[PDB]
Design a protein around this nucleic acid. Sequence first.
RNA 1: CGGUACCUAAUCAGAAAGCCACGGCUAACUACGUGCCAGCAGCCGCGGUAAUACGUAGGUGGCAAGCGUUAUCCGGAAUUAUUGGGCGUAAAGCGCGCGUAGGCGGUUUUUUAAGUCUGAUGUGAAAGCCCACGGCUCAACCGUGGAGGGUCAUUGGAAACU
RNA 2: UGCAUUAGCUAGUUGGUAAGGUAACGGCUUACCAAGGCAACGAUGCAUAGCCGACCUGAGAGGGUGAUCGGCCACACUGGA
Lengths: 80, 198, 156, 89, 131, 135
Amino acid sequence: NDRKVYVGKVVSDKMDKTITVLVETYKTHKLYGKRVKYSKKYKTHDENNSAKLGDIVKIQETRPLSATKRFRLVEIVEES
Amino acid sequence: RFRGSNWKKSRRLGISLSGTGKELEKRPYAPGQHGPNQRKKLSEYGLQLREKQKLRYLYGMTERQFRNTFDIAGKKFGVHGENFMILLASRLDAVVYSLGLARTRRQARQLVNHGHILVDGKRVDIPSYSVKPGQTISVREKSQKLNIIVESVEINNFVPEYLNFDADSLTGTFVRLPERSELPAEINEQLIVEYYSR
Amino acid sequence: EFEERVVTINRVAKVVKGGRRFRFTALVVVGDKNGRVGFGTGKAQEVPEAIKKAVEAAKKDLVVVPRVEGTTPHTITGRYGSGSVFMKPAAPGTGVIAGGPVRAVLELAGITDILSKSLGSNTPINMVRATIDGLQNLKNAEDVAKLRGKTVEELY
Amino acid sequence: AVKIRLTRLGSKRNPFYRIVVADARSPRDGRIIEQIGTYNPTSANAPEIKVDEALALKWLNDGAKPTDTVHNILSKEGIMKKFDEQKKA
Amino acid sequence: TMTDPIADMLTRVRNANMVRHEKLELPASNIKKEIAEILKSEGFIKNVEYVEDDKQGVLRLFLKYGQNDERVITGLKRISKPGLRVYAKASEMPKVLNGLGIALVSTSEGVITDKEARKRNVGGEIIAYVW
Amino acid sequence: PTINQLVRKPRQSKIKKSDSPALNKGFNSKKKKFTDLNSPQKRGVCTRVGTMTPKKPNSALRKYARVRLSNNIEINAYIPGIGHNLQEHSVVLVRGGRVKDLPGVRYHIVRGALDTSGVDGRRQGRSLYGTKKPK
RNA sequence: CGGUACCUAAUCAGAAAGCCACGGCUAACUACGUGCCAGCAGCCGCGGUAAUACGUAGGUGGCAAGCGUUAUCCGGAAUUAUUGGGCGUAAAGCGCGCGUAGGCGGUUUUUUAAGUCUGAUGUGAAAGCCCACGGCUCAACCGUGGAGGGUCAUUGGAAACU
RNA sequence: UGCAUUAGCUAGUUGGUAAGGUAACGGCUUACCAAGGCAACGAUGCAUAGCCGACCUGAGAGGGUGAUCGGCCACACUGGA
């Protein structure tokens, strides 16, 4: 009764329901364990020009019944 | 023991101890290959692997079988100065053919390996297995009588510590595992394993 | 109070006029087996004589090992130049735990509880250096805990 | 697929079988309804039933099925025919 | 250079104690001086004397050593830099060298110390190998 | 070498050179392919024995062998033993070794495989063969 | 699969043992045809009218169903390095310097509990986390239960770093 | 997936809206969207791939381990409706 609700950062613009995510996280090593920054993204295009381009947002982009944005959106939060 | 019997061969056997020996009329050195010469058990190209015979055939099994017995030594992984030695030196080659157990210890493994030994229990035909408490290594009750079976009232009873016997067909006890009380000390707990370890 | 043991020999034969001698330059450990393993060297000549003519020079100075008996409780090692060894302490109820050339000097000081991580260079004369490095730089436990202002076990 | 599997096991003649009824689509070696115990039901002692006796409510009410020998030993255990009493309950 | 005083100043001090120089200076600090306060309380030295200035001032040092001219400063080290630190928790921490080691101390849940948390199951922090 | 800027390459040990191309070679004859499957069973053909007009001083009067097994691929090997039937068109098998007083030569040819002779001049080294293994 | 096992004991001192060499290191003895020839020949050899050694030998050596090798990994040798490599000569240190991201550059205070031996448990892959086992001619090799762990999940919030 | 003596990669492209369809859901095709998106995170491309344990084993660090042997994919004269 819950699904993916991560946080990210928007990139590009067009019709139909932004948020074009770019999440930042950590990845590490075996013998010395250097947990250090890396990222992962999910592209889409602008809501109605509600999603301000360059917006460090709580991300996702709603369930797809057409073809530009991937999956379960939560809410637009913060501009960046 | 040493691949030898001191009735004829007390010579290459550092210890065989079956008979009178051959230092009297014979030279007691050796007939071959197991005198005190340059055999490599030392600083590892030295002069004691003839006494590796004193180490190996003492407890019966040959190498790659005595090699089985030494990893069995490493099995009891407590004090590997003593907990390896106690079970490495916990067999019976003294219940076997000639001299006193009944008359069964010396010319060792001729006859007691009957295949019909009929221990207290079902059957254990091979004393290589350290005998169990209550499981008495008896002989075939139906073919029992020998010069090696009921001669313990006169020649010698009492195989090593916590390993006792009876007289009626020589029923062992092995009530407890044998410590170093009546077990041997010829296999060095330190040097004989330093041939293996360091 | 030192330790008795033979270390090695060496037949020196120099480029000289006549026949090259083969003086058996020998190093020996001498004493009566306390824990303070004292070795020394010597340049001596005759086949049966050079053992004692070299132990003559060995005992001129034979070194002390202030030995924390039973076992040096922590990791015990040392180093000089290209020479060093290591000893991880293990249980004393294990028999003899040693390396290749350090086996009989492991028996010299009575610990017989640590292992012998046989490290160091490949140099034979300084093989002695690598050996003795491990146990020449020692200091006892209670005396250090006293020296550090606190008690013997306030610091534990 | 689906009958009480008397499943092959062991070294040279050590057929230490296991109580099982394999899946309706899996083989004797494959996945199963559920593994219910560790005993050879052809043991020289007896059928010798040691199972998850509390699991009679799930696999009997969904999918499982004995075969001609253990439906007896299950209901002198109080499982198989006794699940018919449970269904009547 | 002095993430630790044992980093660069030890270049001076390791000889200064060979020559019995039993007093020196240090940058002004509160955790750095705290850990030396632990060590002087253990009896490494006389005492961590205090700061003359406010900001990176001279905390005075007063280094006693062994009565036998011995030194049990068996190396102490750290890697602090913007780019190298512990963005990471001693809600559990173990010890090394059977408790003889005593060295650097840094975390955030509730005040104990390196050796004062050996038993807590919310431990401390140890770097050095003393014996 | 660093550690934090070592993430672009770890501080580790080193790598291997070429070793025995023939011990572990194969051949796929489907599409002019060239295979490897790590088997001692790889073959050749019996060709040659000889030397050439010296420059270096290596003194030895012993048999050279450009001599090999069934299917032709050119190598440089050894024919052990004095009694030998290795002139041309032979098939053999091969193992490794070097006996002293032999310059640089480092392989062998097993005795009695398909088309060679046997061992004659050694009678005190008697009881070999280890598998069909009586006394 | 078994008129075989169990058994009478029928059976008798019966019906069941080779290696490189006899070479310094290979411990297997010195010898001869052996005169750096044959050729055994592993670090290295020997051999030239005094071969121990080529060839041969009665014993003969290290262990025995025993005898030596072949491809793989490692002992050997951390002679492969956080742990457990250095770089002048030796395994390696740049005509050079000048430079952005960076690695690392000095910090002095302070808040979170996110990680810095989870609390305790359901909790754990075999030839592989502790013991019990049974059979193993011992073995050859098989399996069994607990410990189910003391190993993940699940619950925690809080220093003197962040 | 690994790999530049493989680098600049890609073009309804970059996968929402409307029509269609998956028990589910989509550029899956279409009327619109920016040349964008992908980047030496060596994408592209080359090589390769059924996958794990498996064993051996370096002091611990822990790991290479598929033949078998077990588990988990794909194919059953090739291919195509």
